[PDB]
Amino acid sequence: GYDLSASTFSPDGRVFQVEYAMKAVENSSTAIGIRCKDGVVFGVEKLVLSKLYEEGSNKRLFNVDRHVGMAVAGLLADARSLADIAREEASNFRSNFGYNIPLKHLADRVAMYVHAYTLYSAVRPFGCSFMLGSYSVNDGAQLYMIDPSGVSYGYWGCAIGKARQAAKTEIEKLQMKEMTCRDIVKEVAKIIYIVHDEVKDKAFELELSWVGELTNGRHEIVPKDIREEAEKYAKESLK
Amino acid sequence: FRNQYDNDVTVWSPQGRIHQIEYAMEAVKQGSATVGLKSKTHAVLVALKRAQSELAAHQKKILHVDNHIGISIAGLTADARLLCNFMRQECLDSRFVFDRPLPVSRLVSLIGSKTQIPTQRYGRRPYGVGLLIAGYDDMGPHIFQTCPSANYFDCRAMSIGARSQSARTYLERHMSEFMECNLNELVKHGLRALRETLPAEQDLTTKNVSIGIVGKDLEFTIYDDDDVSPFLEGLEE
Amino acid sequence: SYDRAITVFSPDGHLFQVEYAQEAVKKGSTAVGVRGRDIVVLGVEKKVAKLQDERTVRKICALDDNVCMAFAGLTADARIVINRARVECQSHRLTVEDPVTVEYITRYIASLKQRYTQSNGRRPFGISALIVGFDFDGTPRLYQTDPSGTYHAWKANAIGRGAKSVREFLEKNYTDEAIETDDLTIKLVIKALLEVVNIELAVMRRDQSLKILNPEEIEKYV
Amino acid sequence: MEYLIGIQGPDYVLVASDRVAASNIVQMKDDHDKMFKMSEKILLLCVGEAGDTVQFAEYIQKNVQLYKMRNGYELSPTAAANFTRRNLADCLRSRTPYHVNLLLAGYDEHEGPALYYMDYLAALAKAPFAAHGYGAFLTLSILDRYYTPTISRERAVELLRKCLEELQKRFILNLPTFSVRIIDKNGIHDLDNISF
Amino acid sequence: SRRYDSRTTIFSPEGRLYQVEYAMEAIGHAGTCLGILANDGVLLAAERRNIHKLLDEVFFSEKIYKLNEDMACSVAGITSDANVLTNELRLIAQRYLLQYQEPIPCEQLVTALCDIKQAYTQFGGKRPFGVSLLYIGWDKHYGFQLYQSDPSGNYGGWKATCIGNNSAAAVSMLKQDYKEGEMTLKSALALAIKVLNKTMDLSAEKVEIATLTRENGKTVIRVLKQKEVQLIKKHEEE
Amino acid sequence: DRGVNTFSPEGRLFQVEYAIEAIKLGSTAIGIQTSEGVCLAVEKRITSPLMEPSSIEKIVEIDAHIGCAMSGLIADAKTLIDKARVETQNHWFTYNETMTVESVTQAVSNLALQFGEEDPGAMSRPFGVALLFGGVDEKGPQLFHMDPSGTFVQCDARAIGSASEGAQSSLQEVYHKSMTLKEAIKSSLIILKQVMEEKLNATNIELATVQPGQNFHMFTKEELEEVIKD
Amino acid sequence: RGYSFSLTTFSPSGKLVQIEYALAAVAGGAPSVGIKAANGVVLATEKLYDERSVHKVEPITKHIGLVYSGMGPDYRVLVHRARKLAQQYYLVYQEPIPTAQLVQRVASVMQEYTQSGGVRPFGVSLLICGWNEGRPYLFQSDPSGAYFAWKATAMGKNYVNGKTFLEKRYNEDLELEDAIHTAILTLKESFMTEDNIEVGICNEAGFRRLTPTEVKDYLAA
Amino acid sequence: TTIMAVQFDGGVVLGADSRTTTGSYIANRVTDKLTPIHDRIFCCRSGSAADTQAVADAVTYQLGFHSIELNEPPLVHTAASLFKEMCYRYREDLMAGIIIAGWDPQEGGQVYSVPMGGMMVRQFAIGGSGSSYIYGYVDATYREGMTKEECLQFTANALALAMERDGSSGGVIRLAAIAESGVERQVLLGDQIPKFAV
Amino acid sequence: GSSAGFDRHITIFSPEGRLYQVEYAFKAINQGGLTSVAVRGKDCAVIVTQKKVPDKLLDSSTVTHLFKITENIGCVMTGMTADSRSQVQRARYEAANWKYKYGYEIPVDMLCKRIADISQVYTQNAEMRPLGCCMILIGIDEEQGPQVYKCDPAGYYCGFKATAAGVKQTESTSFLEKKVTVETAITCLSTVLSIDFKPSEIEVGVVTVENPKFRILTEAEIDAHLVALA
Ligand SMILES: *[C@@H]1CC(=O)N(CC)C1=O
Ligand SMILES: *[C@@H]1CC(=O)N(CC)C1=O
Ligand SMILES: [Cl-]
Ligand SMILES: [Cl-]
Ligand SMILES: [Cl-]
Ligand SMILES: [Cl-]
Ligand SMILES: [Cl-]
Ligand SMILES: [Cl-]
Ligand SMILES: [Cl-]
Ligand SMILES: [Cl-]
Ligand SMILES: [Cl-]
Ligand SMILES: [Cl-]
Ligand SMILES: [Cl-]
Ligand SMILES: [Cl-]
Ligand SMILES: [Cl-]
Ligand SMILES: [Cl-]
Ligand SMILES: [K+]
Ligand SMILES: [K+]
Ligand SMILES: [Mg+2]
Ligand SMILES: [Mg+2]
C-alpha cells in the first residue's frame, strides 16, 4: 500500500505513482524523433480508433515556439497542458531576455515543472513523455526528451510509447549525423511502419513534422507531397 | 485490486489508468443518445430527450452558445451548464476584444485546457459530461466531441450516450455521402442514425426529438416540438 | 485552513454528524417550556454538587430584555450560540429600531445551526434550545431549535434527557385548566420535571422581564 | 451649532442640550434629542458632524447594552467613558474617523456621580461641569462664577437656567428650547424642557 | 489528505467528543491541584511533579501563575499547553484593561479563554489543549471567586474543587469537611493539607500553596515560603 | 474514506444519490398546472398536538407571482428560498420587470453541485430538498420541479416526497389539459387524503394558488374547510 | 498544499504518542551533560570527518549557549530560531535576553509543532546555559515544549545512569574548573580525545566553546 | 554627468566623468560611473545615483543567474533587455539614463542606449546632462571604421569638451575598452585630459 | 523495527523514534546505480563520478552529474536524476541571492548548510516527500583552503577530507580511511567498482588554490591521468 501517493517512498526507495504514470506512456503508440545533419524530424504512429474522426484529429505534434516542435506520447490531455506550459515558458523568456529560448533551457524549465508534480499528495504526475526539437545556425540541431519523473536528456535519436525498444533498434542502424532531413523523413516513416503491430492495432495515420535549415529554423508539418512519398517508400520497404 | 485506486483522480493504478476518469466517462454513457454530423456547408445536432413521466417536459439537450456555435450534452446536467456558461463567456470575450467570432477549434482547446485541471488536483473530480459541438467559421462546418478525460476530437460525424454504438455504426456506413448532402438529407441521416439507438418498438416523435443547425447562411437554431415536424415527415420506417 | 467536509450524506439520506449532535442533546439535562395565557415558564434539571456556585452554572439565559432561552446538550457550544444571538439582538435594535420578535431570533439561531451542518471544517452545534418571550401585541411565544436548524413553535415542549417521556406527559396534561392561572402554569413545569428527576425555574411575564425564582419559592411547590 | 452642558452635584449629574436640528439657514427640527441612554444610569450627549454623531453614539449604545446582556451587570460610567474613548481614538487615524464631541454623565453606586468631557480628538477629562458648542464660550464663565461642589439639584437647575438665558441674550444663534435630564441613584429622570 | 486526517473535531455515534475525553484522561494523570474559597480570601494548593533533587528552582512558583493584579491560576495537564493558555489569559486581561481602564472581572477572563478552547473542539481539525485550570481572584462584582475550566471550554464556579490525580477522592473529602460560608483562610489552609495528605502518594518540598487576600483596598497574591508550609506540623497533631 | 466529489463505477455522484434519497423522508407535496393557474398542496405532517401547525411552513411566497412547495430537509431549503427571493428582486431592480418562473428555477439550481472540500467554509454537501416552483408569467401558468442534482423541468402535474410514486400515478389518471383550477385543487386534496398517514383536516395541510388574475394566495383555515366539505 | 490537521493527538489513555516517540529519538541520541557550578555552567557532548566543520555546542548570544541530544537537523532549526528570538528581544529592549526568557520563547516554538497542522514534533531536547543577573542558569527543553531548570543533568543514550552518577559527584559549592572535570567523567561512563567531544563554558565573560587545545589539557587530569 | 560609448571592430570603448553633485556641491569628485555587469558587459550610469546603482545591482544578479543556467557568456543584447524591462516597468519611479556596452562572441562589440522612459536602441551613444554640449562635436567628428585607439581619443576629447561647459560634469575621465581578450581600464587626470584654449 | 499507524507512509516518528520515509530516501539514492568520490588536498578539491551511456542514441555531452553552482563552486549529484537537478537549481538560486544581498560569494559550508536546512523541512512536514538525492560541493575558501561538503536527504551535512556517495559508498569510505588528490579519487572509484576506466567512463571536476574557478576536465585531460596511473 506504498503506491497511492507521489509523496510516499516504498521501502526500497521507489515512487510507484511516477512508475504507474510511465506505464500510461508505455501503453501509448510510438512517437520518434531523429536529429540529423541540419535539423530534427518527428514522426508519430497515430492510431485510428474510429473512421468517424477527421484526418488530422488528435494531433500529437505541436509548435511550442516558432523554432520549437513537440512530439508526445501518453495521456493526450496532460500532453496538451504541457504544450501550454512550454509555450508560456518560451513566450515569457522572449519578453524578459529579448530573444528566442534555447532548446536546452526550455527542456530544463518544462522538466522542472514536470518534476514538481512528483513530490506531493496534492497532485499526480503527468502521464506523458515528450520530445522537443529545434534548429538554429548558432545552436545547430537539438533533440531533448522528458519523461513523467522530470528527467531531461539530449538525443541523436529517440522513441517513446509501446514499441520504443523496437524503434531504437532501427534508429541505431542509421548514421543520422551525416544524413539530411529529406532522407530522415523517409527513415522515420519506415521505422514507424516496422514497429507498427498490424495484427493488434489496425488503421493508423502517419504524422510528420520537421525543423531545420530547409525550413529556416521554423518548426513546420512535413508537406503532404513529401509525406506521401515517405509513406510509399515505407510501404514498399516493408514488402 | 482496484478498491484503493478508484476513489481519487490523483491516483494512478498499476496498469497506468485513472479510474475516476473512466467512471466519469460512464456518466456520459448513462445520458440519452445524441448525434452530430456535417456537410460542406452545414453542421447538425440531433438529440433524444428523456421524460421521467408523461406529465413532465422532455429535458433540453441542445444549447445555444453563440450565433455560430451550439452544443449537445450527455451526462451530468449541472456540469453541462457549468461548461456551457464557460463557453458562452469565452465567445463574449472574443467578440468584445476582437469584434469577431471565436474560431470553433480555439474554443474546444480552451475547453480541454479547462477540463484537464481537475483531473490532476486532489479532492477535485472530472467533468461528468460529454459534448457534441456544432459550429461554422472561416474553416467551414465543424463537429467536435469533448470527453471527461479532457480529450477532444475533430469528427466527420459522432454519437455519444446510451446505445450510441449503433448510431456510430450507421454513420460510418453512410459518411461518404454526407459532404455532398443538402440540409434536408443531412438532417434525415442524423435522424436515421439516432433511430438506431431506440428499441424496436420505440419511434422518433415530435416530443422526443431535438434538432440544432448551423451553416453558411444560418445562425445556430434549435428546433423543438412542432418545429421538428418538417424534418420527420419525409422519413421511411 | 481546515476544509474537510465533516457533515456528509450517508446511503439512506442520513446526515450522521447531525444525528450524533442530537445524541449530545439527549445527554443534556432536561429542559421544559410551557406557554401560558399571559406567562411563559422555563424549568431545567440541575445535575449539582453542594460546593458549587449556583450563579455560574445556569441553563436559563437572557438574550435580550424581551427574549430568553434554555438549552440542553454541550454547554460550551451553548455559550457560543447564546453570545451570537445576543450580538444579533443588538444589531436588530440598531437597524430596525425595534426589539427582536421571538420568532426572528429563533430563525437566526436556527439558520446559524443549519450553516454548521453544511460548512467545511466544522462540526454541528450539539444543543437544542427553547426560546420564550412576548411579541409587540403581547402574544406569548415558545419556540424550539435543534442541531439540524429546524425550528417550530410549541404550546409546551421538553428537550434533553428523557424528553420523550416528559413530552408524552405534557400531551396528556396541557389543557386550559392547567394554564388557567400563573401558579398552575409553574406547577405543570415542575410536575413535568418530577417525572424524570435540584431544579432551576424562571418566569417571564408581559413586559416585565426575566425573573428567576428563589430556592425557597421552589421548595413550596415541591 | 449644537449646545451641551453638564453639572455634577454631590449625588447627581444634571445635563441639558439644545433641541434644534439645523440645515443651512433653516431650523429643520425644534424637538431634536441629542441624548442617548447607554444604561439605567448613563447618558451620552453627542454633537458634531452629520451622520457621524448618530452612527458613533448608537454603536456605543448597542455595545454597552451587549456588555450588560453578556455579563448580567452594567458598565460603570468610568468604564463606559474609557470604552468610548478607546473606540474614538482607534478610529482617529483610520479611514473612518468620527467628528463628534461628547459628554458622558452617569451615577455609580460605589463611586457616586460622574461627568466626562471628550472632544473629537478623543481626549477624555473628568470635570465637575463642562459644556460643548459655541454656546460654551458664553456659559463656562457663569459656571466658574457660581458653581460650588456641594450645589443642590434645585440650585443646579437655576444655574443652568442662567446659562441658557445668557444664550438667549448674547448668542447669535436661535436656540429656543432645551432638553433637561438628571441622573442619580434612582436612574435617569426627565425634567421639564426649558423654553423661551 | 483524507487518509492521514484523524478528524479531531467530529462527533462519535453517541454524541461524544473523543479528543476532549482523552484530554481529560491526560489531566487525571497530572499533579493534584485544588482550590478553596473562604470569607477572607482564596487559596490554591498544588502537588509539585518536579520532585527531583538536582532541579534548580529559579522561579517563585512552578504551577501557580499570576494573570493580573487581582488574579492567579493553577493548571493540570500538558505543561506546554498550559504555557500557551496562561500567556493568552494575561493578554486578554491586558486587552480589557486597555479598553475599559478597569481590571477584568474574573468570570469574564474565564469565559474568554474557554471560547478559545471551545473553538478547538468545533473547527480547525487540531488537537484540543490538554489542560484544566483553577482560577482564583477578586473583583468588585462578586469579591473572592474560584473557577475551573476543562478542555471542552466548559467552566463553573466553586467554593472548593480539585483537578488532577485522585481528584474524585479529594472532592469527597471537601463535601464532608467544607463548612459553607464559615471558612476562614486559616481553616481553609488546614483543610487543604488534610486533603493533600490523603490524595498524595507529605513534604513541604512536594507541595506549593498560594493565597489571595485583600489589604488596604488592594489584592495580595503570595506563594507561601517553605517555612510557612509549619502548616504540615499543625495537622499531624490532629 | 472517500471524497464528496467521487464518482461511482456507474458514473454517479454518491452524495447526490444520497441527497435524492433524503427527499423520500419528506412529506408529500403536489403541484398542478392549469390554464387558470397553478396550485400547490403539501402535507404538514404534525408529529405532536403540542406543536403549533402554523409554524410549519412548507409553502412560501417567492414573489407576488411565484410560490414554492418544498419536501425533504426543510432547514436546507430556507437558504434556497432566500436565494430565489433575492434573485427575483435583483431582476426587478436591474430590468424593471418580473422574472419568469423558469429563470427563478434556473437561478436556484445554479447553487446545486456547488459543493466540495476545495473555500474557506463553502458548502460541504448538496441540499437535501426538492422544490416545486409554481407561478404565472407571460408564458402563462407554469410549474417546475428541481431536485438536489440541480436538474429542473416543467411539469403539468408533479408530486414530491415519500408517497410521490403513488401520488404521481393518481395525477396521471386525473389530469387533463382543459382541466379547471377548482378541479385541480380538489384533485390534489383527494390524492393527499389517500397518501397521507394522518386523517386530512384543515390544520394538517397547506394549500396555495397563483392565478393570472391575482397574486400568490395562501388558503386560510376557513377557505380550506370549504374545499374539504365535499 | 499543506495539511491543516494535527499529526499529534490524544490516545484513549490520555497520552500523546508522537511526543513519546520523539523522546525515543532523544534517548537514542548521543549523550550530553550540563553542570551548573557556583560561578559558571559547562555543556559537554559526544561526537574522514572534519570535526571542526560542524558544531553541537553553539552560541545563541554572547552570554547564552546551547547543546542537544537527538536529531541534529532538527537542532539547527531551533538554533536559528533561538538566535532570531534573541535579536528580536534585543531590538525592542536594547538588553541581552535573560536565559529564562530565551528558553520560554524557544519552548513555545517546540509546543507549536505538537499541535500545528501537518507537522511532527522536534526530535531533540535542548540544554541551554546562560549568565545574567550575576548568576548562572541551566535549562532543559523537551520535544513537548516543557522546560526545567537543572543544577546538573544528562540526556541521550545512558542518561539514566549519567544522572545518578552526577547525583553522587555534584555539590553546590563546586566551581567551574572542577565542574568541567566531572562533566567529562560523566561522558566517560558511557564512552576519548579532544576530537570526539565538544565542551562549552558560560561565566561572567560570556559563553564560548572550549578550544581543542583547552579540551586536551582537561583530559590530562 | 557625461557618459559615452563607441563601437569599433572587435569591441567597445566606454567613458564617463567622475562628478557627483548635490545641488552645486560636489559630494564625490572621483565617482566611478562605469559599472561592470558581467565579464565583458558594462553600463554607464546617469541620473539618480540611488536609482542606477539599485538597477545595476539587480541586473547583475539577474544576468549572473541566467548565465549560470545557460552555461554560456551572456549576450550584450540580453543585458540591455534586462535594463530596459526594469527601466520601462518602473519609469514613473526611476530617474535613470543607461548606456549598455560590451562584447559577446555572437554579435561582437555592441552599444545600447536605455534613456529615461525605458526605450532601447542600438547605436555610439552619449548621455547625461553634459551630453547636450557635445552633440555637434560627435556629429562632426565621428567616422565609420574607427580603430580602438581612435575611439579612446574620440571619447576622451568629447568628454573633456562636455566637462568644460557642464557644471554638473568634471573631475577625471574614466575609460574602458572591452574586447574578446578582456577589459582594459584607465583614468585621465590633470594634464592627461585633452585641453582646448578659451 | 516496530511500526504504528502511518509511520511508514509519512514522516512521523515510529515507536523507536525513527523516520522510515527518510530511511527510504537513502535507498532511493542507490536506484541510480552510480558512485561518486570527492577528495581535498592542500592545493585542490576534486570530484569524480561514473558516466554510464548505455544507449548510444544519447547525446553523451548532455549526460552529466557535474554542475556549476557558481563560478567557484562545483558539485556532483548522486541519486534520482530529476530530484538532483531540482536541488542544483535551488543551490544556484541560494548562491546568487546570497551574493546579491551580502556582496560576497557564498562560502561552501554556508551553501551546504542552506541546502541541508531546506531538506530538513521535508523531514518534518507530511505533505511532500524528501528528495532521493545527495549533493557534494567543492570550492576554495579564502581562509580555510579547498573544501569538500556533503548533505543528505535527512538534512545532515559535514565537511570531509574525502567522501563518497551512491552504491559503493561504504567500500569507498573504507578505501579512503586507509589512505588518510586527482589520482586518489580515480583509484578509489576504480578499486570499489573493479573497472579500470576509459576516459569516457568518468567525469572529473576540480577547483584549485591557483585556479579557484570550477573546471570540468575534457576527455583528453582525463586520459592523461589514466595513462599516468598506468
Ligand atoms: C470520450 C471518448 C469516448 O469514447 N467517450 C464516451 C462516449 C468520451 O466521452
Ligand atoms: C557532521 C559531520 C561530523 O563529523 N559531525 C560530528 C560527528 C557532524 O555532525
Ligand atoms: Cl478519451
Ligand atoms: Cl457514449
Ligand atoms: Cl429598540
Ligand atoms: Cl431532545
Ligand atoms: Cl494588571
Ligand atoms: Cl420525490
Ligand atoms: Cl487539510
Ligand atoms: Cl543560524
Ligand atoms: Cl563560540
Ligand atoms: Cl549579484
Ligand atoms: Cl535620458
Ligand atoms: Cl541619458
Ligand atoms: Cl545626468
Ligand atoms: Cl568633479
Ligand atoms: K565643469
Ligand atoms: K515529508
Ligand atoms: Mg468621514
Ligand atoms: Mg526614487
Author numbering:
A (entry chain T): 6 to 244
B (entry chain S): 2 to 238
C (entry chain Q): 2 to 48, 50 to 199, 205 to 229
D (entry chain X): 1 to 196
E (entry chain P): 2 to 202, 206 to 233, 235 to 243
F (entry chain R): 9 to 126, 129 to 240
G (entry chain O): 3 to 49, 55 to 198, 202 to 231
H (entry chain b): 1 to 123, 125 to 199
Paper text:
Here, we presented peptidic activators of the 20S proteasome, which were designed based on both the C-terminal sequence of the yeast proteasome activator, Blm10 protein, and the interactions predicted by molecular modeling.
We crystallized the human 20S proteasome and soaked the crystals with 18. In the α3-α4 pockets, five C-terminal amino acid residues (10–14) of 18 can be fitted to the electron density, whereas only three to four residues can be modeled into the electron density present in pockets α2-α3 and α5-α6. Compound 18 penetrates deeply into each pocket and interacts with the proteasome through a set of contacts typical for activators containing the HbYX motif. The C-terminal carboxylic group of the modulator is directed toward the conserved Lys residue located at the bottom of the pockets (α3Lys64, α4Lys61, and α6Lys62). Despite multiple binding sites occupied by 18, the gate leading to the catalytic channel remains closed in the resolved structure.
